[PDB]
Amino acid sequence: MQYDFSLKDPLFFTLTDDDLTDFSSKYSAPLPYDWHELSNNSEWVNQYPIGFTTERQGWKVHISSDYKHSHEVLEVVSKVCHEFRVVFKYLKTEKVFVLRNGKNIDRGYSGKFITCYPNIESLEGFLKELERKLKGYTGPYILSDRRWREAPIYLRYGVFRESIPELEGNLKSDELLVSGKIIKDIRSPKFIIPEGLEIPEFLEKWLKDIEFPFTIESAIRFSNCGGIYNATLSSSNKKIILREARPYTGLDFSGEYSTERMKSERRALTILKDIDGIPNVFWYGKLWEHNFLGVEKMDGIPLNHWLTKNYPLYDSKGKEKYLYRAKNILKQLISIVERAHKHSVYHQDIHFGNILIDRSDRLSLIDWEQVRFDNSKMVEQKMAAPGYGSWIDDYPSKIDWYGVKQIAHYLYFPLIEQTSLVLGYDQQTFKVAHRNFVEMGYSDTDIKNMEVIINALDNKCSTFDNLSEKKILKPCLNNLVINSKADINDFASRLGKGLLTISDEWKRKYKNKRIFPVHYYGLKINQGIAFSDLGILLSYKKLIDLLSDKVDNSYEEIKNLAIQTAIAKFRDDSPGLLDGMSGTIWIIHELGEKQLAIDLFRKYYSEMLRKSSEKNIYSGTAGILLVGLYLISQHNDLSIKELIISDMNLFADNYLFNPSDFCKVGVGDTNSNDPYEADSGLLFGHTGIGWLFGEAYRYTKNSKFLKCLNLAIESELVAYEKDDFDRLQYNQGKRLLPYLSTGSAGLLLLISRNKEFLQNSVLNNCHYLEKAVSPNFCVFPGIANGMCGLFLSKNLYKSNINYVQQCKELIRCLETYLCVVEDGFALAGDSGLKLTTDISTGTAGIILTLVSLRNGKLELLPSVQ
Amino acid sequence: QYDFSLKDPLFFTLTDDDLTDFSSKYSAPLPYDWHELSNNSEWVNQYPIGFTTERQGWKVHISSDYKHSHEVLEVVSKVCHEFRVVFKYLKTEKVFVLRNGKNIDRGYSGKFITCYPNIESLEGFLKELERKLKGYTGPYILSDRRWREAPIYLRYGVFRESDELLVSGKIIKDIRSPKFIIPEGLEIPEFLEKWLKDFPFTIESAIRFSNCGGIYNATLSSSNKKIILREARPYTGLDFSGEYSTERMKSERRALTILKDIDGIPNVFWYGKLWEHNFLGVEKMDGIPLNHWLTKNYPLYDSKGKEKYLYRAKNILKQLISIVERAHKHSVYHQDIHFGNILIDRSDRLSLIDWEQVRFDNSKMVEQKMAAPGYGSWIDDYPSKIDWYGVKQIAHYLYFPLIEQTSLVLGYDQQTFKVAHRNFVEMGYSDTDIKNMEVIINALDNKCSTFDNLSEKKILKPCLNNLVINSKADINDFASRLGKGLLTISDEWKRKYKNKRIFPVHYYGLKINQGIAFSDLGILLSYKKLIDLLSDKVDNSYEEIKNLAIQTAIAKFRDDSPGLLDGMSGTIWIIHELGEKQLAIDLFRKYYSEMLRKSSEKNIYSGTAGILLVGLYLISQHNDLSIKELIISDMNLFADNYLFNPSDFCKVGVGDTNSNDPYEADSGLLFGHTGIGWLFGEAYRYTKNSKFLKCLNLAIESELVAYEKDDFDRLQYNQGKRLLPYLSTGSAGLLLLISRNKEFLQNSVLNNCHYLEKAVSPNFCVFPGIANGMCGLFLSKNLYKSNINYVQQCKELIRCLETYLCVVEDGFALAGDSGLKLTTDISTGTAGIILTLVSLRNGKLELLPSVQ
Amino acid sequence: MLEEVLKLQLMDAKE
């Protein structure tokens, strides 16, 4: 799907639709007596005459402007529009103007300050009067449009309004009507004229009035400032990197454009003319109206890619000289931006994307767009990568050293995104990285030489007093000693206290909303066991029933209103287990509402199985079948039981009949972490089918279900491949994922669970998948895409398992990703940026990990004994 | 109380629903073993994780000025982190400004950090606080006492969980009063016992008290001259520009010694500092303010006895112009010139007071700080232009005293300028007086500044042209504009406050979402009756809005509101009138027996008489239901109790309060015996028992006890200070009571209606609402008279409503019973106009249930 | 070269 989360809250993820704090200056125009001004958006303000509407399509007029002359161009354009009575609209505030004329907005939606709608007849005089009165006013070229004559007046053929037009005109707001046909309106950085529409005569004259000193081969990245092109200079046949800045774009809140912090970049790269590891400006000049910068193409993959090839994720075998090379890379960075600070040049944006490493370990520092030149002041870092920007308003000389300190901690333990949330997290992971680097077998002199440089970079930064809203989060400096079940119960009670503390503070800040902060992959959902509040309430209940406490006073009312909200929002455009209503009804069954659960399940079973699209356990019919199997195994009085077993038999016959028609049987190409763009593992693939038909075999014994189990194993190990030593991991096209949702940790759970029924030839893979799921460093802490599923696969259904000895490893691994709030624990999900309480990424997955370790059976999926 | 905010530019909103918060934060460093929890919207608490405080003890209150508030916090927090004491502090800089402001109670004044120490560590805590807050200055907190000299102040109160101060087994309860109260029976420590043991002018009274100090009426001993006195406590009286009352008093002294020779401007008699309080002793002159002089002298009803109003008003306006011109000659600018800053004596000599906001520089555009609502400038203007805007609005106030809506609609003063001219040529004034006043007002209009309306209230335009009403299509067009502007106002309210009330209303009913008077279902009922009036169809989503509002009203019942204008009894009646009946009988038979019994009030607005009205309506429209006898028996016992004692239900006599609050009102239709007589008249129309007629005749006299005559035979209800002719609290409800029960009452009762009809027909009405306003007067004078015409009555109604009407989009809106912001309710709003039109069309009054 | 210049935006490996 599409997510519009914002990093505006200091502690939590929040959508931009819930962002309303606008202290910027409001744009306004005078309103005549026979005019009305109406807003029905968060960006635009519509002005229309009384009782006059426009057409549904036609030539719309776009007007762009500067930031300084934007309030006084609105007066001129509104004064023009108040004789030529046309419907025009403009941007709300100055912040909307900056975010529309910024950098990371789409090139087809950018630059539009004022949009006008003359019908067909006032357009000719309207364009002439706007051309006559907009002298001296300049603005960005809008890429989807075409400039009229010389003033910032821009035209396209587009859709004016939504329907109107007698009854409903049988048309939509995305498709135009040319000669009684359906042509879609493409909103792209291009001028699209649909073929066949009658151009007027003056517009026909306007449309009929339509060598570089380099050779551009391709493009690397595109933005509202303009592209970054991989070009080759014609005068030398030498490959460079191009970067353009179309005028009056890249607006920030300082008031600068991309044409100003490009003369700044040219001056910065001219001052640092001869430094090893620094790009050189080779060509700078304006072509038409776009100025171009030719910098030296520094070779090398970025720092995260070099780390992914070179960090000891699993063992020290082969990567036996990592710390010496990382020390050399860090010293190369320190030398480069300390020779840069002698020339009064400050980079102000140092993160893992701005360092490139060669195959011979040579460092290059790029992206000098945000350079400062005069120290002298406590300045604000404008646009910084999260985890690397400075916390306070400091000098330009210390912002680069903070960036170098975070690169130093990145090279020594790759968890940096939580240092922007918890102050002192770089010392929390310092001891963990020391323990990991003495556990692998590294030399003590290499660790000492790394740690001396890191500790010397720690003293080169600024020590401040935390005054922000995220100073309630403290690191875990003291490691807990786990020796008995009381020490495990203390940790579990601290998890339960921190969960309710963070929930109460979220409900304090955001009323009339969700009762729990959730990772941005599931912000605008409240169903299914990955991101819902009901799953967190279930995890809290099974945590209370683990250490035998009582409910936290208002917990019964919280779970009553959560269940009532789930009933009120019980849709049907889903049927999923971990994103929909089968997981919601299994939560309702597990919370203590079993009669209401079987009632509502038998109420919507037929429609909620018939209306479905996918086939996985996540968002396909397998989740419905597994909830029905749990309901008829726990309760043998279901009147809909025969329809459940017949649908399982039909699904089994379809699984034997159709090959590779359930999901993708292959490698794949998607390299993202979105759950809807993954098609493998326990949650998204044939392993969910095997989990369904290894429990259907347990309850309703058939040869067809064991045949489905072996077919699921034989289909799943096609994509699983042997690594360098002994590891079997799934390929997502460009990377390998041993996680519980997409890889080796989900398959081994049912090979170990169904080990008695299954044969020997694919219990032989239990050792090949065992050390492929035991690394030394795991990036995320969650149960699905992280360490708590890696631990659960390694330990659960493995026989002769001690609770205390397993928890002693678990808590020791869990004190890497933890933070302290009140007298409890909180944790950040699969970003590290903001606090999460959900199951698939946040604290409730750890709570369910402890519950599933105590009980011996999973709580993420039904595991009927 | 009503904690309403004038922050939204269009509608009344609540201060609890305020979340702008520019408001630079106050922050203190948090150690590892401490937490910071902010439960309130103004306080931020810090505690050392799991360590509590005693329930009673000695607080420590620490004050600070505006400049050093960010540094006192960093010292007090560092002390409290050593001596581990639960302390709390203010959230933002804005709430510091409001807590150290001017119009705040002196029980909540100056408190910046409220520490909660223990008894054992209190001596060391106070020693470290005195050692490290030495040199810092702050306001004095009147409820506490200063420790030695530093801004540490001490109070014995309640630390946490309500206000009970139980000591030695007796409830004492702490009071947030501006005095130092030591409660009886405390184990006082030794150092706190040693600490507790270590006028040229005569004060006659004190007019006003505030956070700046007080305004006193005094007398010099040396000169024996009656003066007025001002106080400025140090570092108290902060505004958003960072100045205190001690500087405003110095500016007032500078201004009043610059303007020493000008008459009407007070002279400085005594300026001295006693203790630490600055005192200014300028001259008190005789006279009443401009509001009381205008209420005494404006021709509210006729011109008899006030024939020379436009001559004296012209002379007084010339005096104000001369005073402002002579003040502006010496570069002295008043910056707050409204009806409360001008005194006029019995000889009609003007005096201009309250020079606290005075300025001395005209070279820069400034912003008016404490602007009166309706007199403040819309833009950042020059100070001379700000004073001339104030004088122009005072001129318009003397010409037509509707001045509050000029802060909402740009051009309302020239809208009411034609209304005032028509009223003055209709009353029989001379042409020369009108021209001589109008040339002065038009001269003051040109001395102000013109500007473009770029605010959010640019969508409200004045009703410049009078609608020509000749036929019923004109009334239908007017009503279509009313219902079309109502939906526009509703949708634009919905845009800026989602998951809240559907319609915007008065500040008297921001919390009320039930009944006719202040709910959303009533305005939906008004829209439905308007659609039925025009014979049109509802636009797009009226059914969905009505269903969602009905289900929300079902989910928000509470049994503490048993009245039809604020509770369940009106929601049931509206739900019956919205289209579904059997649902309303189901709710009535479910809730009647509990809401008639759980009832403390017994009026119409909140009491059991409204329950009996909405039961009588339900048993009249539906003759077959099980609870029919239970309503008849309840009204029979209710009428027997009325025959037993008429004074036991409401107040029979002159009132005491002088406020527009519905809960502070105790007479009239919705609040007194007139609605009791209304219920009993409908009970006589249904039951036809003579006991109801006897009770109605008793209610007529019980209301008419508190009605006095005047020199012009106008029968108005006496509230004690003002005379009320309105519908809710006055004589218009009585006029509808005799007019509706016309064929039942005796001719001695009908002799009073001729004198009642002169009271309901003035020339000028302050408010446009249906309850406390002009629409109720029009309904009382034009319902149930003899024949009831429609075109002529609607022509006069539209002509009188054009004084108050706004224009939004393609329709009309209404500013309420303050005039400040837009309302849509059936008491102060557009739906009142809507049901005024529908009740003029359909005969019967549609504010209360009735039978046929 | 208005056109050419603007064509550059319509290259590949975009945003």
Ligand SMILES: Nc1ncnc2c1ncn2[C@@H]1O[C@H](COP(=O)(O)OP(=O)(O)OP(O)(O)=S)[C@@H](O)[C@H]1O
């Ligand atoms: N001098 C250079 N040498 C080699 N590669 C470069 C150079 N400059 C840019 N690049 C490449 O361009 C990619 C992005 O760099 P820039 O476009 O300079 O920064 P940017 O992407 O504009 O900053 P963002 O992410 O848009 S806010 C990098 O991944 C590099 O591969």
Ligand SMILES: Nc1ncnc2c1ncn2[C@@H]1O[C@H](COP(=O)(O)OP(=O)(O)OP(O)(O)=S)[C@@H](O)[C@H]1O
């Ligand atoms: N110089 C004066 N002569 C006579 N009466 C005065 C004088 N100053 C104030 N008053 C009386 O006090 C009232 C005006 O109160 P103010 O002193 O102006 O209140 P303030 O505190 O200055 O401002 P407000 O009313 O609180 S916003 C009037 O009723 C006056 O009669």
Ligand SMILES: [Mg+2]
């Ligand atoms: Mg970059």
Ligand SMILES: [Mg+2]
């Ligand atoms: Mg005053």
